[PDB]
Amino acid sequence: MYLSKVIIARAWSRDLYQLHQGLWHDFLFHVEKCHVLLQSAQMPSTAVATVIKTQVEFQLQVGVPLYFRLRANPIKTICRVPLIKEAEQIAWLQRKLGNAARVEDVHPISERPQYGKIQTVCFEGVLTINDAPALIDLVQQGIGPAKSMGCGLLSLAPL
RNA sequence: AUAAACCGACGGUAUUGUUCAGAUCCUGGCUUGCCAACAGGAGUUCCCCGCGCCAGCGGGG
C-alpha cells in the first residue's frame, strides 16, 4: 500500500467530481486544503496531478490505542438522507467499524455541505484495536457511501 | 468666374563663462472601554445498482 501527498492543480480542482479523475490518471483520498492525501494500491505524476511525496503496510497490534480521523457520509434510506443527530452519528460510526475496534472517544464535526448533495461528517477521536486484520481491510476499502467524493478514508495515528 | 484671374517673403546664425544658504532649538503635562449571552436547532440527497421481512441495509459515480 502507498501513502502519498498529492497536489491537484487548481484548474482541475474546481468541482468535487473533477477530483477523483485527476488522481485516477480504486484508491482513497482526503482533502487537506488542491492539497490531498492519497492512499493507493499502486505508486502515484501528471501535469494535472503533481506528487509531492509518496509505501506502507503497518504491523499494528491488538488492544492498542490510536488517534483517528475520518470523513464519511452517514445516511439513512426511505434517497440517501443524512444523519444529523449526534447520537445517530456516533452509533453509525461504531456500527460501520463493526468489530475491528471500539470507539473510546469521538467528536463528530458536522462539516459544511459539498456539491446532488453530499453531507460529509468528519469523525475525530481515539480508538483501540480490537480486530487487527479486519481494521486493515476497513482502511483499504473505506467507510460509507460517496467514497469517491473524498469520504471514506480512515487516517490513523499513535499517541 | 467678384480691383477679379495667374500669384512663396525668401536664404545664413552656441547666449556664453564664474558661484555652500548657513549657524542655534524637549512638543509637553493628565486619562478602566465597560456592563448581558447553550451553537444550538433542522434527517431532501439528484442518480445507476445489489439484498431483504417494504422497515430499511450495502457497493460503484
Side-chain angles (χ1 to χ4, degrees), chain A residues 35-38 40-41 43-51 54 56 58-60 62-68 70-75:
Chain A
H35 287 242
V36 118
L37 226 62
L38 186 60
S40 60
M43 183 186 304
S45 326
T46 83
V48 193
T50 131
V51 167
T54 70
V56 71
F58 359 70
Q59 269 311 291
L60 253 57
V62 196
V64 164
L66 297 175
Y67 282 110
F68 83 96
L70 170 98
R71 280 202 185 81
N73 182 22
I75 44 91

Side-chain angles (χ1 to χ4, degrees), chain A residues 19-23 25-26 29 31-32:
Chain A
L19 282 177
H20 49 60
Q21 299 149 350
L23 334 175
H25 300 125
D26 196 25
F29 74 97
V31 49
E32 314 188 275

Side-chain angles (χ1 to χ4, degrees), chain A residues 2 6-7 9 11 13 15 19-23 25-26 29 31-32 34-38 40-41 43-51 54 56 58-60 62-68 70-75 77-84 86-94 97-101 103-106 108-111 113-116 118-123 125-140 142-146 148-157:
Chain A
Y2 285 95
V6 174
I7 322 93
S13 333
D15 201 331
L19 282 177
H20 49 60
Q21 299 149 350
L23 334 175
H25 300 125
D26 196 25
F29 74 97
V31 49
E32 314 188 275
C34 176
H35 287 242
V36 118
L37 226 62
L38 186 60
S40 60
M43 183 186 304
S45 326
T46 83
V48 193
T50 131
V51 167
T54 70
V56 71
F58 359 70
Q59 269 311 291
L60 253 57
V62 196
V64 164
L66 297 175
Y67 282 110
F68 83 96
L70 170 98
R71 280 202 185 81
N73 182 22
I75 44 91
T77 302
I78 92 116
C79 353
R80 326 237 264 227
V81 299
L83 296 178
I84 61 177
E86 189 177 42
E88 300 173 1
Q89 292 176 341
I90 301 183
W92 182 95
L93 176 62
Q94 182 62 75
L97 268 161
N99 303 331
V103 180
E104 307 280 39
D105 187 49
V106 67
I109 309 170
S110 166
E111 276 177 350
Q114 279 184 304
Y115 282 86
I118 291 296
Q119 234 300 335
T120 155
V121 169
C122 192
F123 296 96
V126 40
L127 302 174
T128 170
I129 303 169
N130 184 271
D131 203 344
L135 185 61
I136 309 298
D137 302 21
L138 202 53
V139 167
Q140 297 176 348
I143 300 176
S148 57
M149 307 284 91
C151 307
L153 180 55
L154 175 61
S155 305
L156 303 177

